[PDB]
Structure 1
């Protein structure tokens, strides 16, 4: 992954800044990473990153809360995950479109609003890579993938990107995506873009057909000091779930049509040794069940306004954000965060962070099959302290955090319902490092996640307490190898066979993957992967084989 302190991210305050000036822990994944890892799903990308505990249908915890506490953006715009299945729908999003992922841990409601409690994951779909690639893959369980994309300059000012992708995984999960983007520089300072994409996913679990489209248009001003962006988005999905013996109209079939509209205006200016920024946005999500008549459905709206600042004063860096949100269902809620870094000697820094964040129950949690119209907003207070250094070629960081959540919402697989866990306290350690030894590059992370009910002190269920992630990359005789190791430690779950239901500890699981790639020609790269090398049943050993031809 991209581990340079100099790499630019946009996800911390919406505008470009070096990762080294973001005081919260950041991970950047590039399309190169994705391509080398040969990931076939967004989960395969996420599973690799600090704090993320994914077991595959998938149970995901990030820093001790379920994935709904991490806000997912596509190109800076909230991905509608307010459907019946909540954040589980992240797995419907096509890997073909992830060109980069910026992942910043820790609260960021003070910039983005509801849901950014554990972190923010921004799946960026655009990349500067002109030309044409044809890709395809085959693998275990009749896996088939075919992909064409091209990115062409249509004059000095205009760039069009087009992509189509067919993916079929066992009839299992079929997923067809199209994507087009227009990027235009009216002048050197003014730019605009229009991007549209969609996918039709068919899943046999009990048949699901999801048709989704998302359109975004934006204007950007990039001045010497002042930067502004105005973005409007619209996303629409129709989601059919039915028994194929009876079809989509059967009385027990469901159709949920969802829409999300966003208008967002963000500004930033370079001032002193840093920047300040502010922005306002309005967002609305709607859902309508079987009928198509919006009177039959529900909607939630939100208007927020936020302030951000970054300043370097001598060896100190101060960073803050504050936001106030007006939610049509939950009213007004403010959040704020601040961090201070002290580079006490060059290359080494201590960082202390504090922030509040919240999550307002969304349409699915309130009115969907699994929900409850009486859910309260979840509110979080987080403290984190970090030590990072560069030592003898080793880029490292370790932090401790604590997250006190009021009215944390967990989901109970047994009752099939969200429920309010009450007050939860998560205490955690994150360590990361990367370093090279000769031809080997090592990317390592460790997490300890101690999530408890703060009142009774009882561990929260289904969370791995430890996560070890190790990636090993090297190139030898033009073969590029990547070994991935993951350990997800011991978890607690309920044994429902006998009443009273006992809490039982589940074992940790180790999984290994081996990937290799060879540039057959300067245009043709051939890739293979063995996932779950040791065939661990705990979803066993799977192979994949693919090629790309760049024009």
Structure 2
């Protein structure tokens, strides 16, 4: 199988991770011709993305019916800094040109990573191993324009340098400029070090976002033992124009180890994080300094037809103190190629600055808490790889605005019951990748459905190659959703009808160096919204190329 590092921080085959797992490579992203992260993500199981319009507009990610703030987004294994002020991940500003791989694991994972990993985890990896220089560019609808240069070069054997530059610009709009460098060095065959730095300057209509991140690390990859020590600094500055500045610095230091033992592994690590915000950030008066340290244990073992996986973690947070989480999954391969999996896991979400210290702050709030149970069957039948999972997620201690006392409190519960079905198979030269999600996400106290969430989704990718034309068709059904209408007070909840959407993409190797690509997004120009009142794109055309040398 393809490897992931996201389940326990170290490489393992994805057949040994029991939680459902999706991997997107750069090759997929080039064929899809995605011009944003959201477009990559909306394609995958359990993902419901809403957006205040097109590219660059604020967005929310609802994994498996959970709140916007209950997905953990990592960049190269570190909590996305853009999410630090608001406490909820928004990838609409993150440059797609940095995205080399996505590992997405559904279900909880606080027991490895701490806060936010309730619905699942999305790790965006920016590292590639692909020697050479490449030039790319695109033109499309709304004066869309992209230029991109990158290279990877040995500087002597043992060392290599990566550089990337990207400019993307789209009127009505959204402008984004990105720069990335890395140095990778192999001290021995087992020992390695790296320093990575990147930044992007975005403008959106007037919002002005700038972010930089620097990472530095040491890894040991032995025959049995693996170790990693990584430090990370991020600094973002977010201007809105009267005058609002949100600024945050995030520091991380993590040390993990993992050893192969019996038929599997055992791991442990320690994780430290500091976030400082500047006065006035998040409509909070003072600057804050929040700290967290966690310690966790992981395990995986195969015995006969059974697989057991687990993680357990204790976090010590400077505001709410101590919270412990744990996860266990057992799988049973009862006949060759078929498997039942049962999982249980707790996870949490930390209070955010606004909830804590804003005008309606409550400095004594506790984390939001999740308990999740999941059961799955997977199999390989007649060339079809498939899986069907049912899950229940009880969330409690939700942080809610109390209008009577003008303060946030822990109160309030949600019950989510869902089914995920996926399959992939070929029929002659055709490859089919399909998924179906049912999500019944409610307020558990009133029994009413949560807003902003599609109860059902169907997703289908159909790929094939005919001459030297490589074709991809993308279909999605976004089901019924409820939302509030803010044009009239009191704001009333409205029912937004299901919608089907189609994209067509093609690529062609003009020569061995030159690939040209075309896309039509929203082929039937379907008029729809994912947030009530905010119009989405309509039919758009892209045309691009890349040249390798």
| Superposition TM-score tier, normalisation by shorter sequence | over 0.9
2:208–2:239 CA contact under 8 A, matched in 1: yes
CA contact (8 A) 1:300 1:363 kept: no
1:491–1:505: 8 Å Cα contact kept in structure 2?
Answer: yes
> Are positions 1:98 and 2:99 aligned together?
yes
Deviation at 1:420, TM superposition (A): 6.6
Shift of 1:119: 0.6
Q: Residue 463 of structure 1: CA displacement? A: 0.8
Structure 2 Cα separation of the partners of residues 339 and 406 of structure 1? 22
- Deviation readout 1:406-442 (Å, 9 max, x if unpaired): 0335899999999877110000000011111111110
Residues in 2 aligned to 1:418 and 1:505: alpha-carbon distance in whole angstroms: 28
TM-score, with structure 1 as normaliser: 0.92
Q: CA deviation at 1:53?
A: 1.0
Where 2:18 maps in the other structure, the secondary structure is coil
| CA offset digits 1:468-525 (Å, max 9, x no partner) | 0100111110101111011110012234666775543210111111111101111110
The worse-fitting range, judged by mean Cα deviation, of 156-165 and 21-30 is 156-165
8 Å contact 2:368–2:396 — kept in the other structure? yes
C-alpha contact 1:83 1:89 (8 A) present in aligned 2: no
CA separation of 1:392 and 1:155: change in aligned 2, threshold 3 A = same
Rate the CA distance shift 1:543–1:345 in 2: closer, same or farther, 3 A: same
Does residue 353 (structure 1) correspond to residue 343 (structure 2)? The answer is: yes
Contact 2:131–2:151 under 8 Å retained in 1: yes
Per-residue CA distance 1:188-216 (angstroms, 9 max, x = gap): 11101100100111111xx1111111000
Distance in 1 (CA, whole Å) between partners of 2:427 and 2:188 is 46
Q: Does 1:232 align with 2:255?
A: no
Q: Following TM superposition, by how much is the alpha carbon of 1:542 offset from its aligned partner in structure 2, in angstroms?
A: 0.6
Q: 1:461 to 1:370 in 2, by over 3 A?
A: farther
CA distance in 2, matches of 1:492, 1:544: 32
Instruction: Spell out, residue by residue over 1:319-370, the C-alpha distance to the aligned partner (whole angstroms, 9 max, x if none).
Output: 0000000011111000000000000011100000000000102335545689
Q: SS at 2:89's partner residue? A: helix
CA distance, structure 1, for counterparts of residue 170 and residue 320 of structure 2: 40
What is the total number of aligned residue pairs between the two structures? Answer: 533
Uncovered stretches (5+) of structure 2, i.e. residues with no partner: 51-56, 528-536
After superposition, give the CA deviation of every residue in 1:95-131 in whole Å (9 maximum; x if it has no partner): 0000000000000000000000111111000011100
Question: How far is the alpha carbon of 1:57 from its aligned partner?
Answer: 2.8
What's the secondary structure of 2:211's corresponding residue?
strand
2:181 aligns to what? 180
After TM superposition, give the deviation of residue 255 of structure 1 in Å.
1.3
Q: Indicate how the Cα distance of structure 1 residues 415 and 522 shifts in structure 2: closer, same or farther if over 3 A, else same.
A: farther
3-state SS of paired residue (1:395): strand
> What CA distance in whole angstroms lies between the structure 2 residues aligned with 1:131 and 1:301?
41
Cα separation, partners in 2 of 1:363 and 1:270, compared to 1, 3 Å: same
Query: For the residues of structure 1 that align with 2:243 and 2:186, how far apart are their CA atoms?
Result: 47
Partner residue of 2:129?
128
Structure 1 residues 208, 86: CA separation in 2 closer, same or farther (over 3 Å shift)?
A: farther
- Measured against aligned partners, the alpha-carbon deviations of 1:266-325 in whole angstroms (never above 9, x if no partner) come to 000000000000000100111104699999301211000000000001000000000000
Q: TM-score, normalised by structure 2?
A: 0.92
Q: 1:465–1:489: 8 Å Cα contact kept in structure 2?
A: yes
1:83–1:266 Cα change, 3 Å: closer
Measured at CA, do residues 499 and 130 of structure 1 come closer, stay the same or move farther in structure 2, by a change above 3 Å?
Answer: closer
Residue in 2 aligned with 1:477? 467
Indicate the larger mover: 423-432 or 363-372: 363-372
Equivalent position to 1:455, from 427, 430, 445:
445
Contact 1:83 1:368 (C-alpha < 8 Å) held by counterparts: no
Q: Are the structure 2 counterparts of residues 492 and 413 from structure 1 closer, same or farther at C-alpha, using a change threshold of 3 Å?
A: farther
Q: Assess, with a 3 A threshold, how the Cα gap between structure 1 residues 52 and 410 changes in structure 2: closer, same or farther.
A: farther
Aligned pair in 2 of structure 1 residues 334, 426: CA closer, same or farther (>3 Å)? Answer: same
Change (3 A) 1:253 1:499: closer
The alignment partner of 1:300 has SS state of strand
CA contact (8 A) 2:469 2:507 kept: yes
Query: 1:398 and 1:435 mapped to 2: Cα distance?
Result: 15
3-state DSSP class of the match of 1:35?
helix
Residue 66 (structure 1) shift: 2.7
Distance 1:466 1:451 in 2: 11
By how many angstroms is 1:37 displaced?
A: 0.4
Structure 1: stretches of 5+ with no match in the other structure: 1-5, 242-251
The answer (yes or no) to whether the contact 2:43–2:459 under 8 Å persists in 1 is: yes
Deviation at 1:265, TM superposition (A): 0.1
**Distance in 2 separating the partners of 1:277 and 1:65:** 29
Q: Check the 8 A contact 1:469/1:485 in 2, yes or no.
A: yes
Describe the SS at the equivalent of 1:91. coil
Distance 1:381 1:292 in 2: 30
Cα distance in structure 1, aligned partners of 2:118 and 2:457: 20
Residues 256 and 497 of structure 1, relative CA distance in 2, 3 Å threshold? closer
- Alpha-carbon distance between aligned partners in 2 of 1:163 and 1:368, rounded to the nearest angstrom: 39
Structure 1, 396-405 or 409-418: larger mean CA deviation? 409-418
- Sort the Cα spacing of 1:277 and 1:31 in 2 relative to 1 into closer, same or farther, 3 A: same
Change (3 A) 1:161 1:198: same
Shift of the alpha carbon at 1:59? Answer: 4.0
1:310 aligns with 2:329: no
Assess, with a 3 A threshold, how the Cα gap between structure 1 residues 154 and 416 changes in structure 2: closer, same or farther. Answer: farther
Looking at structure 1, the residues matched to 382 and 21 of structure 2 have their Cα atoms a distance apart, in angstroms, of: 22
Change (3 A) 1:89 1:371: farther
